[PDB]
Amino acid sequence: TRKTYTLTDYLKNTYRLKLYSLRWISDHEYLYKQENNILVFNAEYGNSSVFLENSTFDEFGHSINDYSISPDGQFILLEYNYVKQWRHSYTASYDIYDLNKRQLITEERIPNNTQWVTWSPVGHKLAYVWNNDIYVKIEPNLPSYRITWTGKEDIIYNGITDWVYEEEVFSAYSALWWSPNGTFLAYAQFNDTEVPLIEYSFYSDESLQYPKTVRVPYPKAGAVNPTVKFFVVNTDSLSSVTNATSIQITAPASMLIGDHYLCDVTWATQERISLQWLRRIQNYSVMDICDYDESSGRWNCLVARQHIEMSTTGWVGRFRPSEPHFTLDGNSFYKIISNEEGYRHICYFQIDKKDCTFITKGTWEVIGIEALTSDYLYYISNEYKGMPGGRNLYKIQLSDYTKVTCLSCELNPERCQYYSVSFSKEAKYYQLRCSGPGLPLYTLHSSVNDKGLRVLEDNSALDKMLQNVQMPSKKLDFIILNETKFWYQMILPPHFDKSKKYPLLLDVYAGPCSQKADTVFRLNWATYLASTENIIVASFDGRGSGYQGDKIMHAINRRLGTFEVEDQIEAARQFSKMGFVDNKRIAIWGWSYGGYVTSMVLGSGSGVFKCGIAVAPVSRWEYYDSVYTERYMGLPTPEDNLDHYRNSTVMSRAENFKQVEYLLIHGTADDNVHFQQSAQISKALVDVGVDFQAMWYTDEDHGIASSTAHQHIYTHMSHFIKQCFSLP
Amino acid sequence: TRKTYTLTDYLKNTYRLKLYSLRWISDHEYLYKQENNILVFNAEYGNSSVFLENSTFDEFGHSINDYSISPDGQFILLEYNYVKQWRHSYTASYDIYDLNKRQLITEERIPNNTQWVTWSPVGHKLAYVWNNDIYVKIEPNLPSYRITWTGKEDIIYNGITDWVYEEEVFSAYSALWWSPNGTFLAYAQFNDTEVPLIEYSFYSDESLQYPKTVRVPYPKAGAVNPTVKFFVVNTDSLSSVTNATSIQITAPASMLIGDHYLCDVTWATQERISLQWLRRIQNYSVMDICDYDESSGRWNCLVARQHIEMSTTGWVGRFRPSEPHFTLDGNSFYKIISNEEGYRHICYFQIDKKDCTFITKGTWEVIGIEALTSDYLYYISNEYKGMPGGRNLYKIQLSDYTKVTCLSCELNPERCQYYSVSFSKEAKYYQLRCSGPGLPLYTLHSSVNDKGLRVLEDNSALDKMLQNVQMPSKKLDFIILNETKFWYQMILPPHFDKSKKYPLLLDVYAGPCSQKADTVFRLNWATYLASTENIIVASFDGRGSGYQGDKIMHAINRRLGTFEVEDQIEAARQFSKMGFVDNKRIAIWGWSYGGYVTSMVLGSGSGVFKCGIAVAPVSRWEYYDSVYTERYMGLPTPEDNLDHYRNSTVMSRAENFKQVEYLLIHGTADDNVHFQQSAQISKALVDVGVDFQAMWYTDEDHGIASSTAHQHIYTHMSHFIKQCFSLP
Ligand SMILES: CC#CCn1c(N2CCC[C@@H](N)C2)nc2c1c(=O)n(Cc1ccccc1C#N)c1nccn21
Ligand SMILES: CC#CCn1c(N2CCC[C@@H](N)C2)nc2c1c(=O)n(Cc1ccccc1C#N)c1nccn21
Ligand SMILES: *[C@@H]1O[C@H](CO)[C@@H](O[C@@H]2O[C@H](CO)[C@@H](O)[C@H](O)[C@H]2NC(C)=O)[C@H](O)[C@H]1NC(C)=O
Ligand SMILES: *[C@@H]1O[C@H](CO)[C@@H](O[C@@H]2O[C@H](CO)[C@@H](O)[C@H](O)[C@H]2NC(C)=O)[C@H](O)[C@H]1NC(C)=O
Ligand SMILES: *[C@@H]1O[C@H](CO)[C@@H](O[C@@H]2O[C@H](CO)[C@@H](O)[C@H](O)[C@H]2NC(C)=O)[C@H](O)[C@H]1NC(C)=O
Ligand SMILES: *[C@@H]1O[C@H](CO)[C@@H](O[C@@H]2O[C@H](CO)[C@@H](O)[C@H](O)[C@H]2NC(C)=O)[C@H](O)[C@H]1NC(C)=O
Ligand SMILES: *[C@@H]1O[C@H](CO)[C@@H](O[C@@H]2O[C@H](CO)[C@@H](O)[C@H](O)[C@H]2NC(C)=O)[C@H](O)[C@H]1NC(C)=O
Ligand SMILES: *[C@@H]1O[C@H](CO)[C@@H](O[C@@H]2O[C@H](CO)[C@@H](O)[C@H](O)[C@H]2NC(C)=O)[C@H](O)[C@H]1NC(C)=O
Ligand SMILES: *[C@@H]1O[C@H](CO)[C@@H](O[C@@H]2O[C@H](CO)[C@@H](O)[C@H](O)[C@H]2NC(C)=O)[C@H](O)[C@H]1NC(C)=O
Ligand SMILES: *[C@@H]1O[C@H](CO)[C@@H](O)[C@H](O)[C@H]1NC(C)=O
Ligand SMILES: *[C@@H]1O[C@H](CO)[C@@H](O)[C@H](O)[C@H]1NC(C)=O
Ligand SMILES: *[C@@H]1O[C@H](CO)[C@@H](O)[C@H](O)[C@H]1NC(C)=O
Ligand SMILES: *[C@@H]1O[C@H](CO)[C@@H](O)[C@H](O)[C@H]1NC(C)=O
Ligand SMILES: *[C@@H]1O[C@H](CO)[C@@H](O)[C@H](O)[C@H]1NC(C)=O
Ligand code: NA
């Protein structure tokens, strides 16, 4: 008899999903790290050569974290001494190895504790950030040119983002943008002078006698936000004698009237740059198109070339205004914008014209623009079979928009319904990446006639290993609420019997633009729950979920903690009424936004759920950051939305926790959703005489990702779900 | 069937212990609060009068926290706006009410945010601390005289103690001492400049957007300690001089050689003060006796009057060197010191002779000196029946030491074995306060003849209530370990059957000078557990315990976390041998030092215990304060005792916790035993893969004493014990 997928299998990664992460270096070749060696692959034929041997740095004296080959293939940036900061930020030490003269560079080295580093897009110049200031290196063995002198820790950030812009704006620490050929270097400067500081204890190793206090400039909803300036420097006209001159591009008058943000930077051509600015009330945005004036040496942003993007029903973009995709001449562009029916589609714009032309339409949405040529635009969309949880690669003929070709739909319909893509420099080749419903499949294709060149990775090994395992299945379907269909997914136990009552665990995210019902193949905690414990694990996408139009997505506008909470209950209420679900054994679990939703559901007084687990939950919107919270909630002032901020808390619902079993988990060093949020939930339940289970994780952050902690969290939650469902 | 003593009875205080709190205003009168009215009682006849009617402060506009009448009974200090700080410290607003004029004082008011206030011991002079500076009022409506100008928040403390002096040295916030007739005001000044800060978060009400960081000067073991200086000012000179001089009394040269402490201040006469100094290595103490020199305005301490108190086996005193009791003339004093056998007895000294005469002796100890008259000295001791857990009042004739009467022994021997006393101003009358083994009994006696005047409170109301309740019983006995008697107590369930096997809960303290095996009557959590859950709640006084000689008390000197831990394991084994204990159902629980012993016991690998609860435990000696830790452990340096500090941590035993069910509980705003200690236990358990139960109490301190958190903690603990013992 065959084994089940156990907790130890999930925790020890017994069953590994094989990947194929390649790095395009031209229109014809990619790099692939095989057996610790870097190899060069000709996409057309499949043949390789050794680019770099694993033995090359055996006598290095440091464990190399990562590598970054210069665009010209002449130099290798060696990353070591990695110290993680936030989600994307880190400091490390760098060394440059000359690939041609087979020797490390010992002259003018990149300093230690370097905040960010990047090769120019072409050649081998380097831009780097150290002690909050930007430095440029025209050649690796040559002295650096200092670009900024204003850099100050926790106050003035140049070429790097502060806490909020990293997390909610650029999803990156870098605030550097090189021009296509690397002539110009564009950067953002952040000022956090009056932004209040989130403070928390850090315990460190047992040896630290007194705990350390961590102080992060973090703007909570309604607090003073950072300020932003935008600059462009010419890296071709740098001097050793004279200090560098940075040209400032100011925000439009429409933004300068009040609080705003820089939300997108995208070069159009070698001398044209686009910028998107977003107001603190995230329903108004402005794009500026800025050209380099060779005579004056200034960057002029014509008013005729401004583009207003706005929303009357909600905020702008899924999480922020979308990225424009400029043509070779940069005189026109393509951008995903929400249409008149509230569905996200590609619009075509002229730089000097107000009206744009939608090139796509329908009751589905475009996920992203992936590649652009003079003949075709390539994009991902959830159009195929009307499944909002599916993803496929499409090409639209730019001369005849009626000529839309799906490139992945029919490749393998049974195994592959969720795709991502990666194109070569001029889109000659593409790698398709299938992530479900079947095991991941990686393939290489060529754009000329959309030929299927070869299979890169098929995970056949994992398939052979999974043959001897009692694996769970996945049902993707929908329910109808108020004439609207909403999707759900259920991880069903092996040998599923529709004539038996199974306990049910509802796995929730339910945040704005979330999607928990999809065709992706996952090997996680829910796998073990269904495989070993015979628990149905369900997720549902109600109002406020994304990829289905603004009518659904904007339903929770100015009203977080309402519809998305109600809808989760209505979904569980419906599942309970199915013959195969044991209505006396229904549980709910969520992390981050899902933890807030889990806690609002447990305190709703619905009687549907027996128990629940909240991990690093948000408890009161006034405790979460400005950028995210205010996008959906607006400002927490009496003139704006203070009443909703006030009545959308977990705390006010404490009394309702009397008829449920609750497990509240949070890491002490969470810089994202501060421990404060959970400390306020516990205090409220204590205040109304409600018994619950609690677990803190010393020095753990939002991820609770340290190997020991990760094993500890899932062990502790497993015992709880098991005790709740009367399972041995 | 009769009801049991339930968890609700304990949490809701259904069965109330009546007290008799009187405040002696003279030699024959005391104050008593009956129905919110303050009555004055004539001790000789028991006849009263309303001293101050409940209606007196109806339209005051504030709830009065407490009152204090001036020694002469001309004024009443009304305390309101009570804001708690640490164990003894607080802030408050104060008003003075003229008893004569029956009017409130509206001029030259005591400021708001007053740290401490005290009347002169004679008359109506006032000394108070505001903003770390000492001020004096000769008259309540007249302007204050400023004494100090160095006062600085968290740096200089004049007249008030710092964290460590309040907690561990003086057991008071106060650091001002008036002379007997109020002419002089003596005070200590503490300098916390180089003292490191303990920083922790304070979440406060849900309305507080950003948590506040609480920063306290706190010396952990081996860190920089506060420095101290002592002064004396002639308050009678204030109205004749612009700025009266605070004369310094310097520490002796034997103290100035290194770090030391001021540990005792006692006035002997109108012009004579005694000071006790203690080295940071607490095994050497010095008493200086200082006389006022009328011609120089100086205080002089003669070397002929200097008394040395030292220890070769341990530290000086039980927790600090004891207080001297001077005879009227101030030419001699009585002091409790450790004798040649290691037992604490009363010594009689001449102020200028280094050799003292012991006035008491035997294999028992003197707990304290209560009153000193021209013919008699009154003291509490544990001599009666050789029970170290008992307490009685004795009378010794100063002209004949063979003349010792026990004033309390036989009054009610079945009901009363533990006593405390309160004497009138010149010891004319005494209130005896009996606390067990029967219901507490308060009686008033006269010293002229030692005759009982009347029963003040007998608890007949409670006795009537307790008759319809199945109450547990308490057994107090001993076991002979290595030729030594080691005492224990048991809270036995009702109808205790010697032939039955009962689950046992070992209730722990086990710190140096502890006593958990006594004769006090208590209505607590152990009452509920034994009464309702049929659990035997046992306590044991092993090596390191007090009131039994230095041989037992100093057994743990420089070795905390050893014998006192091992003896608790031995205790449980010996209990199992008694034949009425289920060896499969033995639990261990403790708070503070008890929390540490529980945790150390749970990580020993002994197999004796199934489960255990640790509340606000010490985990590593280097995290606890200097004064407590170093008294027993010395310094955490390689030349002293580092090896033992590093070997006595809970963390080093995290692997043996795999054998037990552990519950870890701590308050987040714990300024005494820092949350850091449980944050380091949990981390160590997570690292070695151990599952456990945790609970944090938001904004709760070492006492977890808020009405809500108290009920919450005992409810959570009860569930855990019941689960461990498989009780429904
Ligand atoms: C608090 C919050 C939030 C909202 N959030 C965001 N946002 C945009 C990026 C930046 C961030 N600050 C705010 N992305 C989010 C979430 C969010 O809750 N989950 C659920 C989630 C978080 C953690 C672990 C499991 C699960 C699951 N399942 C999630 N899953 C994938 C992406 N995401
Ligand atoms: C760490 C530590 C400690 C040692 N401690 C002290 N000290 C002297 C006074 C000043 C303080 N700073 C250190 N008194 C202590 C203790 C101590 O653990 N318990 C047990 C204890 C603490 C809290 C609750 C229940 C129990 C019970 N049962 C206790 N009970 C009565 C007095 N005490
Ligand atoms: C980065 O850090 C290392 C170590 O501090 C520096 O390398 C040398 O390392 C030795 C010890 O390994 C030290 O004595 C010196 O301070 C270092 N100096 C030199 C000149 O090699 C290194 O220099 C730092 N690198 C940069 C670019 O600042
Ligand atoms: C990248 O683009 C820049 C700007 O378009 C180019 O620089 C210009 O080149 C012409 C020379 O034919 C000069 O007359 C201009 O004055 C230059 N402009 C600036 C702003 O410096 C440059 O050729 C490009 N670099 C590469 C490597 O292709
Ligand atoms: C952006 O969203 C807001 C909030 O929903 C809208 O602002 C209005 O202005 C004030 C704010 O003080 C209120 O009196 C109004 O009632 C709000 N208008 C409404 C609700 O229609 C504003 O409409 C939005 N901007 C755009 C361009 O749609
Ligand atoms: C207790 O009783 C005695 C006796 O009545 C009171 O003593 C005082 O005695 C004088 C005799 O000249 C009476 O005129 C007064 O009534 C008493 N004086 C005062 C100041 O009260 C005494 O009052 C009683 N004690 C109390 C507290 O009421
Ligand atoms: C408290 O102690 C500190 C030192 O710990 C004293 O501050 C020093 O004062 C002298 C002047 O007397 C200065 O020259 C030094 O700069 C100071 N040292 C530090 C570490 O600050 C302080 O004077 C003492 N204060 C009182 C009022 O006794
Ligand atoms: C009263 O006397 C004290 C003690 O002599 C004065 O204290 C000194 O104040 C000066 C600065 O004004 C300093 O240089 C000394 O360090 C202080 N010494 C002490 C012991 O505090 C005080 O300022 C005087 N107050 C008035 C009102 O004159
Ligand atoms: C309280 O005691 C003090 C100190 O002995 C007394 O002050 C002395 O009074 C004597 C008179 O008997 C004088 O010779 C001195 O000038 C005083 N010395 C000092 C330092 O003040 C004080 O008078 C007593 N007060 C009362 C009210 O009894
Ligand atoms: C692959 O094969 C071609 C010959 O068709 C060769 O000349 C080319 O450089 C090779 N590429 C690699 C990456 O080995
Ligand atoms: C940052 O902003 C503060 C005001 O918030 C301002 O005074 C300061 O000049 C700024 N610094 C820079 C370098 O722009
Ligand atoms: C450039 O700017 C900084 C700070 O403003 C200055 O101190 C430095 O000396 C400058 N260098 C030159 C070469 O002018
Ligand atoms: C105390 O505070 C209140 C209000 O802040 C004020 O009305 C009063 O004057 C203060 N009293 C003193 C004695 O300073
Ligand atoms: C005080 O303690 C230390 C540490 O044990 C020791 O070396 C010293 O001799 C002791 N002093 C006395 C007076 O016993
Ligand atoms: Na092929």
Cβ atoms of B57 and B64 within 8 Å: the answer is yes
Dmax of chain A from CA atoms? 83
User: Which alpha helices (DSSP H) does B346-502 contain, by range?
Assistant: 460-466
Nearest CA in chain B to A201: B200
Three-class SS state of A440:
coil
For A275-304, give the DSSP string. EEEEESSTTEEEEEEEEEETTTTEEE--GG
How far away, in angstroms, is A449 Cα from ligand 15 center? 13
- Rounded distance, CA B720 to CA B726, Å? 10
Residues of A in contact with B675 (CB under 8 A): 201
Three-class SS state of B61:
coil
Read off the DSSP letter of residue A449. T
- Rounded distance, CA B36 to CA B556, Å? 49
Tokens at residue A12, please? Answer: 């020890």
- Rounded distance, CA B187 to CA B682, Å? 44
Three-class SS state of A479:
strand
256-295 in B: which are within 8 Å (CB) of A? none
Task: Tell me the three-class secondary structure of A574-607, residue by residue.
Answer: HHHCCCCEEEEEEEEEEECHHHHHHHHHHCCCCC
Q: Which of B220, B675, B686 shows the shortest C-beta gap to A712?
A: B686
Side-chain-side CA neighbours of B102 within 13 Å: the count stands at 5
- Rounded distance, CA B555 to CA B543, Å? 6
Cβ atoms of A663 and A720 within 8 Å: the answer is yes
Q: Calculate Rg over the CA atoms of chain B.
A: 27
Cβ neighbours for B619, distance < 8 A, ≥ 6 positions apart: B596, B599, B649, B650, B651, B677, B678, B680, B681
What are the distances in angstroms from CA B14 to CA B8, B17, B120?
8, 10, 41
Look at strands B581-591 and B502-508 and give their pairing.
parallel
The rounded Cα B725 to chain-centroid distance in angstroms is 34
The rounded Cα A503 to chain-centroid distance in angstroms is 32
How far away, in angstroms, is B558 Cα from ligand 14 center? 11
Q: At what angle do helices A707-724 and B676-687 cross, to 10 degrees?
A: 90
Residues of A in contact with B622 (CB under 8 A): 209
Q: Where in chain A is the domain with CATH 2.140.10.30?
A: 17-459
A260 as an active site residue: the answer is: no
CB neighbours (10 Å) of residue B166? 22
Cβ atoms of B706 and B712 within 8 Å: the answer is no
Instruction: Quote the minimal CA–CA distance from A678 to chain B in Å.
Output: 9
Q: Which stretch of DSSP H or E encloses residue A168?
A: helix A163-168
- Rounded distance, CA B538 to CA B508, Å? 9
What are the distances in angstroms from CA A540 to CA A594, A617, B526?
12, 19, 48
Across A683-713, b (16+ Cβ under 10 Å) vs e yields: bbbbbeebebbbbbbbbbbbebebeebbbbb
Q: In what order do the strands lie in the sheet with A332-338?
A: A325-326, A332-338, A344-350, A357-358
Cβ atoms of B510 and B476 within 8 Å: the answer is no
Cβ atoms of A663 and A612 within 8 Å: the answer is yes
Name the residue among A643, A589, A590 with its Cα closest to residue A621: A643
Chain A contact present for B710, CB below 8 A: no
Strand partners, B3: B469
Read off the DSSP letter of residue B630. H
Strands annotated E in B85-153: 90-98, 103-104, 114-119, 126-130, 133-137, 145-146
Return the amino acid letter for B323. E
CB B109 less than 6 A from any atom of ligand 13: yes
- Rounded distance, CA B198 to CA B87, Å? 17
In degrees, rounded to 5, the angle at the alpha carbon of residue B162 between the alpha carbons of residues B158 and B163 is: 165
Cβ atoms of B496 and B538 within 8 Å: the answer is no
Q: Where in chain B is the domain with CATH 3.40.50.1820?
A: 1-13+468-728
- Rounded distance, CA A639 to CA A636, Å? 8
Look at strands B126-130 and B114-119 and give their pairing.
antiparallel
What are the distances in angstroms from CA A217 to CA A153, A192, A622, A678?
10, 7, 16, 21
A237 as an active site residue: the answer is: no
Read off the DSSP letter of residue B220. B
The rounded Cα A324 to chain-centroid distance in angstroms is 19
How far away, in angstroms, is A24 Cα from ligand 15 center? 20
Given the CA of residue A241, which atom of ligand 12 is nearest to it?
13
Q: Which of A201, A622, A694 shows the shortest C-beta gap to B694?
A: A694
- Rounded distance, CA A68 to CA A94, Å? 11
Read off the DSSP letter of residue A111. P
CB contact under 8 A, B199 and A196: no
CB neighbours (10 Å) of residue A219? 22
Look at strands B611-615 and B661-667 and give their pairing.
parallel
Three-class SS state of B714:
helix
679-708 in B: which are within 8 Å (CB) of A? 679-680, 682-684, 686-687, 689, 691, 693-699, 708
Cβ atoms of A472 and A492 within 8 Å: the answer is yes
- Rounded distance, CA B646 to CA B660, Å? 23
CATH superfamily entry for domain B17-459 = Dipeptidylpeptidase IV, N-terminal domain (2.140.10.30)
Read off the DSSP letter of residue B54. G
Residues of B in contact with A715 (CB under 8 A): 689, 691
Strand partners, A145: A136
**Which residue do the tokens 């409220």 mark?**
A684
Give the residue, out of A95, A112, A141, with the most ligand 3 atoms within 8 A of its beta carbon, to mutate for a pocket test: A112
Q: Which stretch of DSSP H or E encloses residue B526?
A: helix B525-531
Cβ atoms of B612 and B598 within 8 Å: the answer is yes
**Which residue do the tokens 């075709």 mark?**
A376
- Rounded distance, CA B669 to CA B697, Å? 8
Tokens at residue B606, please? Answer: 């002994």
- Rounded distance, CA A329 to CA A272, Å? 10
Alpha carbon dihedral A646, A647, A651, A652, in 10-degree steps, equals 130
- Rounded distance, CA B674 to CA A728, Å? 38
Given the CA of residue A283, which atom of ligand 5 is nearest to it?
1
- Rounded distance, CA A621 to CA A642, Å? 10
In degrees, rounded to 5, the angle at the alpha carbon of residue A131 between the alpha carbons of residues A127 and A135 is: 25
- Rounded distance, CA A84 to CA A82, Å? 6
- Rounded distance, CA A63 to CA A85, Å? 19
Return the amino acid letter for A351. I
Look at strands B400-406 and A212-217 and give their pairing.
unpaired
Tokens at residue B261, please? Answer: 């402490």
* A77: phi then psi, degrees, rounded to nearest 5: -85, 120
Nearest CA in chain A to B215: A213
User: Positive or negative CA dihedral for A606, A609, A611, A617?
Assistant: negative
Cβ atoms of B651 and B684 within 8 Å: the answer is yes
- Choose, from A89, A592, A619, A678, the residue flagged as catalytic: A592
- Rounded distance, CA A60 to CA B434, Å? 78
CB B616 less than 6 A from any atom of ligand 2: no
Return the amino acid letter for B420. S
Q: Which of A210, A622, A680 shows the shortest C-beta gap to B220?
A: A210
Look at strands A90-98 and B441-446 and give their pairing.
unpaired
Name the residue among A12, A17, A15 with its Cα closest to residue A3: A15
A592 as an active site residue: the answer is: yes
Classify residue A88 as left (phi > 0), alpha (psi -120 to 50) or beta: alpha
User: Positive or negative CA dihedral for A417, A420, A424, A427?
Assistant: positive
Q: Calculate Rg over the CA atoms of chain A.
A: 27
What are the distances in angstroms from CA B380 to CA B291, B344, B421, B517?
31, 12, 8, 18
Q: In what order do the strands lie in the sheet with A22-24?
A: A22-24, A29-34, A37-42, A48-52
Name the residue among B214, B173, B165 with its Cα closest to residue B190: B165
Tokens at residue B702, please? Answer: 């070492």
- Rounded distance, CA B385 to CA B417, Å? 10
For A657-708, give the DSSP string. GGGSEEEEEEETT-SSS-THHHHHHHHHHHHTT---EEEEETT--TT--SHH
Name the residue among B329, B345, B438 with its Cα closest to residue B394: B345
Side-chain-side CA neighbours of A230 within 13 Å: the count stands at 22
What are the distances in angstroms from CA A705 to CA A16, A169, A365, A524, B688?
18, 23, 33, 14, 16
- Rounded distance, CA A302 to CA A306, Å? 7
- Choose, from B260, B307, B554, B702, the residue flagged as catalytic: B702
Strand partners, A23: A31
Residues of B in contact with A209 (CB under 8 A): 220, 223, 622-623
Cβ neighbours for B56, distance < 8 A, ≥ 6 positions apart: none
How far away, in angstroms, is A66 Cα from ligand 9 center? 84
Cβ atoms of A432 and A455 within 8 Å: the answer is no
Cβ atoms of B665 and B589 within 8 Å: the answer is no
CB neighbours (10 Å) of residue A207? 8
Q: Which stretch of DSSP H or E encloses residue B188?
A: strand B184-191
- Choose, from B592, B604, B648, B678, the residue flagged as catalytic: B592
CB B42 less than 6 A from any atom of ligand 8: no
CB neighbours (10 Å) of residue B101? 10
In degrees, rounded to 5, the angle at the alpha carbon of residue B483 between the alpha carbons of residues B477 and B487 is: 20
Given the CA of residue B243, which atom of ligand 8 is nearest to it?
1
Read off the DSSP letter of residue B166. I
The residue among B194, B686, B690, B704 with the most chain A CBs within 10 A of its CB, best to mutate, is: B686
- Rounded distance, CA A90 to CA A114, Å? 8
* B704: phi then psi, degrees, rounded to nearest 5: 35, 50
**A1-13+468-728 architecture in CATH?**
3-Layer(aba) Sandwich (3.40)
Strands annotated E in A424-560: 429-437, 441-446, 451-457, 469-470, 473-481, 484-492, 502-508, 536-540
